[PDB]
Enzyme design. Structure first.
Site, PDB file in Angstrom:
ATOM      1  N   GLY A  42      31.753 -38.797  47.920  1.00 20.95           N
ATOM      2  CA  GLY A  42      31.406 -39.928  48.768  1.00 20.95           C
ATOM      3  C   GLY A  42      29.927 -40.209  48.687  1.00 20.95           C
ATOM      4  O   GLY A  42      29.237 -39.683  47.814  1.00 20.95           O
ATOM      5  N   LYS A  43      29.445 -41.026  49.618  1.00 22.51           N
ATOM      6  CA  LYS A  43      28.037 -41.386  49.682  1.00 22.51           C
ATOM      7  C   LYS A  43      27.147 -40.158  49.784  1.00 22.51           C
ATOM      8  O   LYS A  43      26.020 -40.187  49.311  1.00 22.51           O
ATOM      9  CB  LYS A  43      27.767 -42.314  50.865  1.00 22.51           C
ATOM     10  N   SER A  45      28.147 -36.520  49.349  1.00 24.84           N
ATOM     11  CA  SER A  45      28.518 -35.244  48.768  1.00 24.84           C
ATOM     12  C   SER A  45      29.447 -35.427  47.594  1.00 24.84           C
ATOM     13  O   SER A  45      30.002 -36.508  47.394  1.00 24.84           O
ATOM     14  CB  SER A  45      29.187 -34.342  49.828  1.00 24.84           C
ATOM     15  N   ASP A 150      33.789 -39.995  62.608  1.00 25.94           N
ATOM     16  CA  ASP A 150      34.261 -40.500  61.325  1.00 25.94           C
ATOM     17  C   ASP A 150      35.731 -40.141  61.101  1.00 25.94           C
ATOM     18  O   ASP A 150      36.133 -39.708  60.004  1.00 25.94           O
ATOM     19  CB  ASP A 150      33.392 -39.996  60.157  1.00 25.94           C
TER      20      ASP A 150
END
Ligand SMILES: Cc1c(Br)c(=O)oc2c(Br)c(O)ccc12
Length: 327
Positions: A42-43, A45, A150
């Site tokens: 993801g953004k 990791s 999240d």
């Protein structure tokens, strides 16, 4: 606004519990753990299936992208705080590459099935079961003074063969402190509560219950994401076309919020769309009054009005799951 439950958790706990900035990491051994295969990214990791070379057991290796030291201590401290709780992913070790100092978080191995492929196969009962498992994690983390911030299918790892569920990616999670104004740029767009979309900054655990409601609506209606806005203004508009604008107006005036003129015009004025209008021949097998009642009690503009995770677990929608357990 304060949380209606668990509001004093951090007040009563020693400052070390919630003071994640004063954490000094005890780094383990980088070569204890070897990457086997990439499993996600993801953004913030990239994530790999791994092996612990000592005992040859599988693990998960989350390699963190360059980010502030603060956000790294936050996620670690939260993880250590919650380690051992129901369906919360276990942090086993923390290591770094000597040369570049890139952190890896080492976790228990979980053998996930992508939700876009898994969720079609879930039966009425399965959905009740897994959502209940996810509620355990949420009640636990809230009880410990933490908001996930999240919640979404992508952050819910499910091993369907073993029927084991883990709540992952505590990277956006935060400690709840009565009165504190939080960054609203959290969660992921389709799962953002109205509080985030209208800049109500003193939010709480209730934010996660909206997110859960969005996930749950998607599952029972087979419409994922349920609220599909293109940007944050559009996200609010899509919500308002379902929940109707009156509920919105009540909410805005209760918390003395004024929508900036452009948003207010985009949202417009809409009557409420009853939950049964989403039933169709693709989803009928999963729509029941108990599902709808439960959903209805999650998706409320007013975050103070949503079910707590404790409350949700006792909803009659989950009664067979609960009975299965009590034997
Ligand atoms: C077990 C696990 C998997 Br599988 C993943 O894809 O991402 C994770 C993240 Br991101 C975590 O932060 C923790 C565990 C996992």
């Amino acid at each position: 606004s304060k949380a209606r439950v668990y509001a004093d958790v951090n007040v009563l706990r020693p400052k070390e519990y919630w003071d994640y900035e004063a954490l000094t990491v005890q780094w383990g051994e980088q070569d204890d753990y070897e990457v086997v295969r990439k499993v996600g990214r993801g953004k913030y990791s990239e994530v790999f299936e791994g092996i612990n070379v000592n005992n040859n057991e599988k693990c998960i290796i989350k390699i963190l992208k360059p980010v502030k030291k603060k956000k790294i201590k936050r996620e670690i401290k939260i993880l250590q705080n919650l380690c051992g709780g129901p369906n919360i992913v276990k942090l086993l070790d923390i290591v770094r590459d000597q040369h570049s100092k890139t952190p890896s978080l080492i976790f228990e191995y979980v053998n996930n099935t992508d939700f876009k492929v898994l969720y079609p196969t879930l039966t009425d009962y399965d959905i009740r079961y897994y959502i209940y498992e996810l509620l355990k994690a949420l009640d636990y983390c809230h009880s410990q003074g933490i908001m996930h911030r999240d919640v979404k299918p992508h952050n819910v790892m499910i091993d369907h063969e073993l029927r084991k569920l883990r709540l992952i990616d505590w990277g956006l999670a935060e400690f709840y402190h009565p009165g504190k104004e939080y960054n609203v740029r959290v969660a992921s767009r389709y799962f953002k509560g109205p509080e985030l979309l209208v800049d109500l900054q003193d939010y709480d655990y209730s934010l996660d219950m909206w997110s859960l409601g969005c996930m749950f609506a998607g599952m029972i209606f087979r419409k994922e994401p349920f609220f599909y806005g293109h940007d944050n203004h559009d996200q609010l508009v899509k919500i308002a076309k379902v929940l109707g604008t009156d509920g919105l107006n009540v909410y805005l005036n209760k918390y003395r919020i004024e929508l900036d003129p452009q948003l207010e015009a985009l949202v417009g004025r809409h009557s409420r769309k009853p939950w049964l209008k989403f039933m169709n021949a693709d989803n009928q097998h999963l729509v029941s009054p108990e599902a709808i009642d439960f959903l209805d009690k999650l998706l409320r503009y007013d975050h103070q009005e949503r079910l707590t995770a404790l409350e949700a677990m006792t909803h009659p929608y989950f009664q067979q799951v609960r009975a299965a357990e009590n034997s």
